[PDB]
Every structure is written in structure tokens, then in C-alpha cells.
Amino acid sequence: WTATSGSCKGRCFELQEVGPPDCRCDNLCKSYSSCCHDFDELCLKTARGWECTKDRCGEVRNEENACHCSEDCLSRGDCCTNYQVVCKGESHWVDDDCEEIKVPECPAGFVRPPLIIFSVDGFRASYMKKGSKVMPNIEKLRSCGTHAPYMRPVYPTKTFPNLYTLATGLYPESHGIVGNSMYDPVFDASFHLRGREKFNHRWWGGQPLWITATKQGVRAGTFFWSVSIPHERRILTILQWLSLPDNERPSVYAFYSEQPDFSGHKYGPFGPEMTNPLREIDKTVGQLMDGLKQLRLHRCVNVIFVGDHGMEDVTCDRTEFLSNYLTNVDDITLVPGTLGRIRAKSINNSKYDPKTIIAALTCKKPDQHFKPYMKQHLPKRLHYANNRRIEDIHLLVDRRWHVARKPLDVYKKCFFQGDHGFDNKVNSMQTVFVGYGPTFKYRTKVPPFENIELYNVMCDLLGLKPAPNNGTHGSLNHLLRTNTFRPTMPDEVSRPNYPGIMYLQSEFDLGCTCDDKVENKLEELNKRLHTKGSTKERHLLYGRPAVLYRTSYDILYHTDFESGYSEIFLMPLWTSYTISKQAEVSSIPEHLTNCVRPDVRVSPGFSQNCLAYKNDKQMSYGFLFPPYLSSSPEAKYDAFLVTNMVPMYPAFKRVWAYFQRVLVKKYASERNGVNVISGPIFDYNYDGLRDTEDEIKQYVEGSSIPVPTHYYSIITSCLDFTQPADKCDGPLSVSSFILPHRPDNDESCNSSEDESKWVEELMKMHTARVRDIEHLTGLDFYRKTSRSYSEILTLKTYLHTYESE
């Protein structure tokens, strides 16, 4: 209930939301049907439109007009944005030459440059090039400021998850806005686009920028605008807030456009009808910049132009129906469209079985346009599992497609030609970033980056300490002229042991055999030097990884590789090796097929054993350093040490063996040598973070050998590929992956074919950032380069996407 009998007199677009039943005058009052009776009359004036004309110049102030052309308007802060152009012979901002802004040029009383976030819904990355002729204001921000070729959204590539990620720096699984539609089984409540439940604060986790600002004494504009407030009025309201007295005036503001998303759904991303929306957005940017120039704030404010996601061609005819796969379609609830989430229609149905649903949806039709996953098996780069609002069963939909439960869902609700929500590495889902202002750089291109990083930078621009988030603070320092954030590397928590030879062969009763009984002072000395780390400079190029948790581990040196061996997990945390462009691939000799050799540096009590692998009829083993890449027949014996062995399902070994035998040498050929760091990951609770020992759900039968959920590799080389990986003077190039350790290849519909037809496709889907592996292992990589730490942070956030242009 609202007493709408109150008045908005002297309250229009007030910043402090007032308490029901009192009537509101803020920019969301319409959304809550709570505005005072006179809001439209006082706060949404339209008379004489949005532009001064020569006949209005010097007019007698008429308070009814939407904006003013009277002499007093600049001091009132309510001129039409084109006032000085029409009435004082000034130029539009877009017609002025670009001039570097080295320092804020602000009016007296400004304590810091304001930040204006100009957010555009559905603004696909390629609009910056394809629409450039019709967006001159945006093209000037882009060319004169700091821009990325694109910005990667989060998954799912929907509006509410991406706008709230921009606000918080958090993954959707952590902020809790995991889609535009959600069911929370703890609240027993549903969140939708239409309706009131979404205004309840219990959905919205973490700490958004406006709260971070307000808590630290920095005043914020209200970020959210009711849809019926015209864009011109949003701009004029921002410009009026910027004219408030110093003690009252916000430092951070947001503009929001529903375009071009609204039109993109109707017409497709490049429908001819898409030209006019882009022109209108460009005109709005023009109104803001002219308005700032009028207030002498155009060389004072930092402007961010940013999108939430792109837009793909999607039509009604490209829908997959679960009714064509499931017998039982009436016993499920589907969250549909460009992703699928499945749960039981009733928690009272004891016959509901997720296993039988996954199997009925797996590789059933030759061109099937979605893939089912239990959420813990989704690519780790999506970070889409650790939330009770994310259903256990997920469908990853192909770009250009929809999934729906039954045909009648599509035509009892064709219309639309565009949609979004797909995997955040798809090119059509990429969006935009431009920064312009005294704190950004001038005429600077930066590499593509993820939208999770922007919260930190917005905090930097405002002198705020960010709330804990998923950005890597410092990784976007290269966007900024000043206010860089200069972090220290984390302290190593556990120092390694460097064991020498301490055990005789006969102390080991592991059930292992090896035909290695094959007997010289020259090469005796060499073997000893290799075990003391004489080659470590060749194989550990960036220092040893730091262990950022309390544990017991050993550094183990070898001719061809170095490892950090966990006495708790009985396997390497990491294995590091360098493969030159010239390296030779060799076989596992027949006499060594089943060879596993005790490591006389490591106690039998801290070793794996072969008898557990023989007893465990599902589990086999593989090696982290590949025997295929040994430098010599003698050095190859090192690769069969029990300390290089890890548990592997036969289905995984198909992938691992092809990687190690074919792909590592391919990458060394293409990249002029590679450095590889490989290892296990344990994430049984799918939270993206290193498991403790007490979280491990599976062991090799009869043993304390824990089974990894995933295997990673980090593959590093010289960005200047004319230099070999091991003699690189400059910046690095990295690609990484986190492969799921699964007992079947059901994820790969073509896994009956030769590994050359499906293994690389799998590894591309499971591409990772080094940062993702850091979270999952508690290791800190690249500790010893001669690069700037911020440059290394940028490298650690890089994702190799494998999308063409």
C-alpha cells in the first residue's frame, strides 16, 4: 500500500529511496507503482521536446518545458544538451578534435573525477566496426580513449547475471543471479523478469559498486531506471545531479539503454532495422558529452561505455524439444531457451532419476544441437555450479539454437530472430568496453578481458577498496594512466623438502615391476647432477610454483622434468618440463609397458602402489611427464618413477596419451618450444577451489590414493615466436586447460573415431585461465620472470578461446 497523495515537489529523482507507505519520486518509483500522484507532471516534463532552437535562445524561463534555453539554464544545470551549440555558437563535442586528457580539469569543489557508466543492453562487440559510420560519438570515445576489441561476458550471457557481475566483480554462482529466471529451493521462491519477487534483496548477493561507494563515503547516483523514463530524461537527470552542491553531488553514475537488445531480439543482430537503434544510442552519447562540455566536465569525468552481452541469430525453427528424447517429459521442469536447466517437476516423485535423463539426452541424433551435463562436469571456465539455484542437469545449447520441453511451448507463447545466453566464449556473445577520461589512457588498444575484472577498475577510478571478488586486481592496470593497483605476490605458505637418496629398493613392497636391471664414472656423475637439479633452469623457466596452503611436499629433480611431489596426496601437485621445437617423440618400449619404479628419494609410506591399480577394475594410471618426450633412452627410466604416476580412467588415458604423444610436440613445433606444467585437480564440491583432504570422495580401491576430478596443463612460450621458449627476452604466450577426469568419453559424441577427430575439440571446450588453475590447486605460477607483476596478472587471466576472428 502507497499513500500516493504525497508530492514530488522539490524531490524529482531523489537519491534516498523513502519508506512505504510514503510515496516515492526516485528513478525506480514507476517499477514499484509507488510514485507520488504528481511525479509525471513535475519529474517527466516533455513540453517542447529535448533540443533548443534559435527562437528559444534567451527565452523567459518556463518551468513546464522539458529542458531550458533561458540565460539562467547553465547555473540551474537544466539547459537542453544542445543549448551552447544553438544559442552560443559552440561546437558539438563530436566535432572537436581528440586532445589527450593528462589530468582531470574539474570545476572547483570536485574532490575526485566522477565516473559515468554508460551501459548498453545487447551491444555486440562487432557493432563497433560494422556500425561505425552511424555512431560518430561512440567512435570518438573508442578511438580517443582506451578500448578493447571485445569484452567477454559471464555465462549465462543474459542481462541480469551480466549487469550484476559488472556491479560486483563476482561470478553468477557467487552473486546468486544465475539466470534471468531462477528457483531457489531454500526460499521455495521463483525469480522472474516480470513480477515483484526480483525486488527482494535476498536474491542479490555480494556487494555492488553503489554499496561499496556509499560504505566508503562516496555518494552514488541510483543505477536502475524504470523503462518508461525516456533516455533524454535519464541524461538530463545525470547532468542535473552533476550540478548539485559539493556535499550532495554523487561521484558515480549509471545510464542504461534497453537498446540495442530490444530490437536485436525482433530483427536479429544485423537486421536492417538495427541501424536506427544504433543511431539513437549514438545520439544519446552525443547528448551526454555535449551536456558535460556545457558544464565544463568533458575533461573531468571518466566515461565507461560497456555492454552486458552480444546477440546471435536464433529463430523458432531452430528449437530442439526434449519431448523428442524423454519418455517422461511431464515429470520435469525445464528452464528453457539458449541454455537448459532441468529439475524434477515434484520432489515427491521418488522415480525421478537424473542418470536416466542424462542418458536419454546423450548423443541421440547425429546433429543434436545441445549437450547434457551434470553441472559439476561443465567446463570449469564457466564457473557455473556452486549455487543451489543452478539445477544439477544443464544443457549447453549450440549457438543459433533453443531448447524447449514440448513444441506447444514455442507457439502457445514466428516472432523473434535474435537471442543470447550461450557459452561466453561464442563470438556473437562478446560485448564492448571503452574507457575515456583523465584516468584512462589515450588512443590505446588493450587486449580483450572478462567483465568480472571491471568492478576492481571502477573501485580504482573512485579510490574505493573493492569487496572480495573474482577479478584479479592489477590485471587491468594497463587500461589506466594513474590509480594503478600495485599488489605484492602472495607469500609462499609451505616450503619444499629437497630429499636425496634415502631408501633401498627392497624397502618398497608396492607390487610394481620394471625390467630396468641394466648397469660408468662419466655418466654416473651426470645422473647424480641431474638428480641434484643441474637441468632445472631448462625445465622450470618461471621459478617453482609457490604453495599457498599448509602441506608437506618434496621437490624432485630429473634430467627432463622437475616436480613438486605431495606426501599427503601421494602424487605431484605440479610437473614442469620444456620441449624444444627440435624435440624427438619416441615410444614406450615394449620391455617398459608395465614398468613402475620405486623412487629411492621418497618413503614407501608416501608412495602409490601398483597392487591398488591391479585390484581397482575401473582405474588405471598415467604419467605426468610423458615417457614419449624423454631426451634419451636412459633418461626415459625417470618417467616411470612411482612419483610421476597419477590415477587415470582408461577413457581419460585415451585423451592424455594423445595429448602427450602428439599434441605437445605439435605445440612445440608451432610455438618454437613450449614449457608445460601439468598436474591434478581435486574439486569434489564444484566450488572452483582446491579441495582439502577431507573433501575427497573417491580413492583408488583399497588405498589412500585420491582420485583427481580434473587434470590441468599450462603451456607457455615466447609471444615473439622467433625466440625459443627457453631463451625468451620479452612477453609470454600461454594456453591452458582443465580436462574433466571422467570414466567414459560420453561428452565426445565422436569418441569411437581416431583421437585426431575429437581430442582437440574436447581440450578447446575445456580451455582455462592460469588463474582458474591457481584457484583449483592453491599454487601461484610465474613467480620468477623478468616481467612486471601486472603484466603477469594479465597473462594469468588470458583465455585461449579458439574462435576465428
Ligand X SMILES: *[C@@H]1O[C@H](CO)[C@@H](O[C@@H]2O[C@H](CO)[C@@H](O[C@@H]3O[C@H](CO[C@H]4O[C@H](CO)[C@@H](O)[C@H](O[C@H]5O[C@H](CO)[C@@H](O)[C@H](O)[C@@H]5O[C@H]5O[C@H](CO)[C@@H](O)[C@H](O)[C@@H]5O)[C@@H]4O)[C@@H](O)[C@H](O[C@H]4O[C@H](CO)[C@@H](O)[C@H](O)[C@@H]4O[C@H]4O[C@H](CO)[C@@H](O)[C@H](O)[C@@H]4O)[C@@H]3O)[C@H](O)[C@H]2NC(C)=O)[C@H](O)[C@H]1NC(C)=O
Choose the one of Ca ion, K ion, ligand YMU, none that binds residue 256, judging by a C-beta under 5 to 8 angstroms depending on kind: ligand YMU
DSSP 8-state code for residue 29: G
Can you list the alpha helix ranges (DSSP code H) found in 308-404? 354-360
Contact between 652 and K ion per CB under 5 A: no
Contact between 339 and ligand YMU per CB under 6 A: no
Contact between 687 and ligand X per CB under 6 A: yes
Contact between 775 and ligand X per CB under 6 A: yes
Q: SS3 for 402?
A: strand
Contact between 606 and ligand YMU per CB under 6 A: no
For the record, the C-alpha cell of 118 comes out as 554508460
* DSSP tally for the chain: helices H, then strands E: 23, 29
The amino acid at residue 407 is P
By C-beta, is 461 or 705 nearer to K ion? 705
Annotated active-site residue in 146, 159, 716, 801: 159
Residue 185, CB half-sphere, CA atoms under 13 Å: how many?
11
Contact between 621 and K ion per CB under 5 A: no
By C-beta, is 200 or 603 nearer to ligand YMU? 200
Strands 674-681 and 710-718: antiparallel
Q: Does 402 belong to an annotated binding site?
A: no
Task: Tell me the torsion sign for CA atoms 627, 629, 632, 635.
Answer: negative
The amino acid at residue 216 is Q
Contact between 312 and Zn ion per CB under 5 A: no
By C-beta, is 173 or 391 nearer to ligand X? 173
Which long-range contacts (C-beta less than 8 Å, at least 24 apart) are formed by 531-537? 531/500, 531/501, 531/557, 531/558, 531/601, 532/557, 533/557, 533/562, 535/559, 535/560, 536/562
Residue 329: CB minimum distance to ligand X, A: 29
Site string for ligand YMU, 143-162 (x = CB under 6 A): ----------------xx--
Q: Does 65 belong to an annotated binding site?
A: no
By C-beta, is 227 or 359 nearer to ligand YMU? 227
Q: Does 353 belong to an annotated binding site?
A: no
Q: Which of 124, 383, 597, 665 binds ligand X (CB under 6 A)?
A: 383
Q: Does 509 belong to an annotated binding site?
A: no
The phi and psi torsions of 114 (rounded to 5 degrees) equal -65, 155
Nearest residue to ligand YMU, scored by beta-carbon proximity: 256
Q: Which residues contribute to the site for Na ion (CB under 5 A)?
A: 745, 748, 751
Contact between 175 and ligand X per CB under 6 A: yes
Task: Tell me the torsion sign for CA atoms 480, 482, 483, 485.
Answer: positive
**494 pairs with which residues across the strands?**
547
**Residue 28 burial by Cβ neighbours in a 10 Å radius (0-12, 13-18, 19+):** middle
Q: Is 801 a catalytic residue?
A: no
Choose the one of K ion, Zn ion, ligand X, none that binds residue 116, judging by a C-beta under 5 to 8 angstroms depending on kind: none
Choose the one of Na ion, ligand X, Zn ion, none that binds residue 468, judging by a C-beta under 5 to 8 angstroms depending on kind: ligand X
Q: Does 685 belong to an annotated binding site?
A: yes
Q: Does 159 belong to an annotated binding site?
A: yes
The greatest distance separating any two alpha carbons of the chain, rounded to the nearest whole angstrom, comes to 106
Choose the one of Ca ion, Zn ion, ligand YMU, none that binds residue 254, judging by a C-beta under 5 to 8 angstroms depending on kind: ligand YMU
| Residue from 621, 600, 623, 506 nearest 554 by CA | 600
**Residue 106 burial by Cβ neighbours in a 10 Å radius (0-12, 13-18, 19+):** middle
Task: Tell me the torsion sign for CA atoms 49, 50, 54, 57.
Answer: positive
By C-beta, is 468 or 743 nearer to ligand X? 468
Site string for Zn ion, 75-104 (x = CB under 5 A): ------------------------------
For the record, the C-alpha cell of 751 comes out as 569418441
Contact between 176 and ligand X per CB under 6 A: yes
Choose the one of Ca ion, Zn ion, ligand YMU, none that binds residue 359, judging by a C-beta under 5 to 8 angstroms depending on kind: none
**444 pairs with which residues across the strands?**
146
Residue 609: CB minimum distance to K ion, A: 12
Contact between 117 and ligand YMU per CB under 6 A: yes
- Strand (E) positions, 504-570? 546-547, 553-557, 562-566
Site string for ligand YMU, 160-189 (x = CB under 6 A): x--x--xx----------------------
Choose the one of Na ion, ligand YMU, K ion, none that binds residue 159, judging by a C-beta under 5 to 8 angstroms depending on kind: ligand YMU
Q: Does 398 belong to an annotated binding site?
A: no
Contact between 303 and ligand YMU per CB under 6 A: no
Which of the residues 248 through 287 are near Zn ion (CB under 5 A)?
Answer: 261
By C-beta, is 268 or 466 nearer to Zn ion? 268
For the record, the C-alpha cell of 260 comes out as 540495442
Q: Does 409 belong to an annotated binding site?
A: no
- Strand (E) positions, 249-328? 252-260, 302-307, 312-313, 319-321
Which part of the chain contacts K ion (CB under 5 A), choosing from 140-148, 244-252, 607-615, 758-766?
607-615
Taking the C-alpha atoms of residue 556 and residue 539, their distance in angstroms, rounded to an integer, is 12
Q: 678-704 burial by CB neighbour count: b if 16+ within 10 A, else e?
A: bbbbbbeebbbebbeeeebebebeebe
Q: Are 62 and 73 in contact (CB under 8 A)?
A: no
Choose the one of ligand YMU, K ion, Zn ion, none that binds residue 749, judging by a C-beta under 5 to 8 angstroms depending on kind: none
Contact between 229 and ligand YMU per CB under 6 A: no
By C-beta, is 436 or 682 nearer to ligand X? 682
Other beta carbons within 10 Å of 785: 18
Site string for ligand YMU, 355-374 (x = CB under 6 A): --------------------
Residue 230: CB minimum distance to ligand YMU, A: 13
- Strand (E) positions, 131-270? 146-147, 151-152, 182-184, 189-191, 252-260
Strands 562-566 and 571-579: antiparallel
Q: Are 319 and 410 in contact (CB under 8 A)?
A: yes
Residue 404: CB minimum distance to Zn ion, A: 17
DSSP 8-state code for residue 3: B
Choose the one of K ion, Ca ion, Na ion, none that binds residue 308, judging by a C-beta under 5 to 8 angstroms depending on kind: Ca ion
Taking the C-alpha atoms of residue 691 and residue 708, their distance in angstroms, rounded to an integer, is 10
Q: Does 246 belong to an annotated binding site?
A: no
Q: Which residues contribute to the site for Ca ion (CB under 5 A)?
A: 121, 159, 261, 308, 683, 685, 687, 689, 691
Q: Does 540 belong to an annotated binding site?
A: no
Other beta carbons within 10 Å of 247: 7
Nearest residue to Zn ion, scored by beta-carbon proximity: 261
Which of the residues 192 through 221 are near ligand X (CB under 6 A)?
Answer: 205-206
Q: SS3 for 51?
A: coil
Residue 419: CB minimum distance to Zn ion, A: 7
Contact between 424 and ligand X per CB under 6 A: no
Contact between 562 and Zn ion per CB under 5 A: no
Taking the C-alpha atoms of residue 239 and residue 292, their distance in angstroms, rounded to an integer, is 7
Q: Does 675 belong to an annotated binding site?
A: no
Residue 387: CB minimum distance to Zn ion, A: 22
The amino acid at residue 120 is V
By C-beta, is 252 or 619 nearer to K ion? 619
The binding site for 1-tetradecanoyl-sn-glycerol 3-phosphate consists of 159, 180, 261, 420
Binding-site sequence positions for 1-hexadecanoyl-sn-glycero-3-phosphate: 159, 180, 261, 420
Catalytic residues: 159
Binding-site residues: 121, 159, 180, 261, 265, 308-309, 420, 683, 685, 687, 689, 691
Question: Which residues contribute to the annotated binding site for Zn(2+)?
Answer: 121, 159, 261, 265, 308-309, 420
Q: Which residues bind ligand YMU (CB under 6 A)?
A: 117, 119, 159-160, 163, 166-167, 193, 223-225, 227, 254, 256, 258
Binding site per annotation, positions for Ca(2+): 683, 685, 687, 689, 691
